[PDB]
Amino acid sequence: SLRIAVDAMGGDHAPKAVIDGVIKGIEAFDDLHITLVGDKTTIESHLTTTSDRITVLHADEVIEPTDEPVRAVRRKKNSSMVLMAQEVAENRADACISAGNTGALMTAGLFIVGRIKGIDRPALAPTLPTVSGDGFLLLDVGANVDAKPEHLVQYAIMGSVYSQQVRGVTSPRVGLLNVGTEDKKGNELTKQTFQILKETANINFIGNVEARDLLDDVADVVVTDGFTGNVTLKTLEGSALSIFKMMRDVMTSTLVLKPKLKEMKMKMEYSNYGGASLFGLKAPVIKAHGSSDSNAVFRAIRQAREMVSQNVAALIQEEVKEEKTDE
């Protein structure tokens, strides 16, 4: 069987959006059981059809989207975020999902759930879209900001694993986000990573990758440090919004179907890939987009489900061993 603890209190639109997505996953997946974590009264007022596959856990408090992560997770020991993480930690759930404070989520993920044996630090990993449509992974966009070469190499392995297990990519192309293609380009961190990735028997290292080609399918996995990762992600996103608003005001003055344009607009929509996972933890912890609708939560439930069944954490535990990266 399978079981996922979900945060209902987090996200712009819940508990409704969260509870509607949960209901869409119990109808599509017969082996799925879910633990709704939130305010018992509030949660009940949104789900009619009582099922034995939906359980509820009462969460007295919330980690607002403004609280300090570390403090919140340490102080609000009865919040939805914290309670959800302990369900996973105490063997009462295999995966967990939240739309709540991303920082609180990673702190809860890191100190409650724990890390896979052999992983120094985890990485926030969302799958972004491409002009074609295949998509790509951007490893580390928030989890940790002053990384070391060692960590980045771990990121390429865990990304490759997820890419070839869950996304079905044959031999995921790993690229290093850099400022030039030559071997010596980048900051000191990047230069050092490049040398090591050249020696990692475990993955298909295509080399450095310029950021102007991210949306143009240059690689299946792009690796970076959280700081540059997070800046790159918000740059892509803002760039899209800004350009869309320009184009869309341009139609409102005097007048490319509404549905035709809608197609591409949806292919860019970041929430069309399921949410960013925290690669490296003992069990899948997914940061569902805060602006998540009913379907987006469903797509995140689907993602946690694939990750467990694909034995992604056990495979990450083997591919990180030096016997597989050296020879």
Domain spans in the chain, listed from the N-terminal domain onward: 1-327
Joined together, the tokens standing for residue 226 give 């959280």
Under 8 Å between Cβ of 284 and 304? yes
Q: Which residues of 107-125 are buried (b: 16+ CB within 10 A; e: fewer)?
A: bbbbebbbbbeebebbbbb
User: Of 120, 121, 112, 69, nearest to 226 (Cα)?
Assistant: 121
Where would I find the beta strands (DSSP E) of 224-307? 276-279, 285-287
Structure tokens that stand for 145 in this block: 């900001």
Q: What DSSP element (H or E) covers 128?
A: strand 127-128
Method of determination used here: X-ray
Domain 1-327, second-level architecture: 3-Layer(aba) Sandwich (3.40)
Work out the burial of residue 72: count CB atoms within 10 Å of its CB; fewer than 13 is exposed, 13-18 middle, 19 or more buried: buried
Phi, psi of 208 (to 5 degrees): -75, 155
Name the β-bridge partners of 281: 115
Burial class (CB in 10 A: 0-12, 13-18, 19+), 223: buried
Residues 73 and 94: their CA atoms lie apart, in Å, by: 20
Helix 312-319 vs helix 294-309: angle between axes, to the nearest 10 degrees? 50
CA distance 205 to 225: 17
Structural gaps in the chain: residues followed by a C–N separation over 2.5 Å? 255
C-alpha radius of gyration, the chain, whole number: 20
| Residue indicated by tokens 């949960």 | 22
Q: 259: which 2 tokens?
A: 């549905």
Q: Which two tokens stand for residue 191?
A: 């230069």
CB 168 within 8 A of CB 180: no
Residue closest to 178 by CA, chosen among 194, 165, 162, 167: 194
Q: What angle do CA 167, 262, 238 make, to 5 degrees?
A: 75
CA proximity to 47, closest of 80, 6, 11: 6
**Residue 297 near residue 131 (C-beta atoms within 8 A):** no
| Rounded distance between C-alpha atoms, residue 21 and residue 220, angstroms | 28
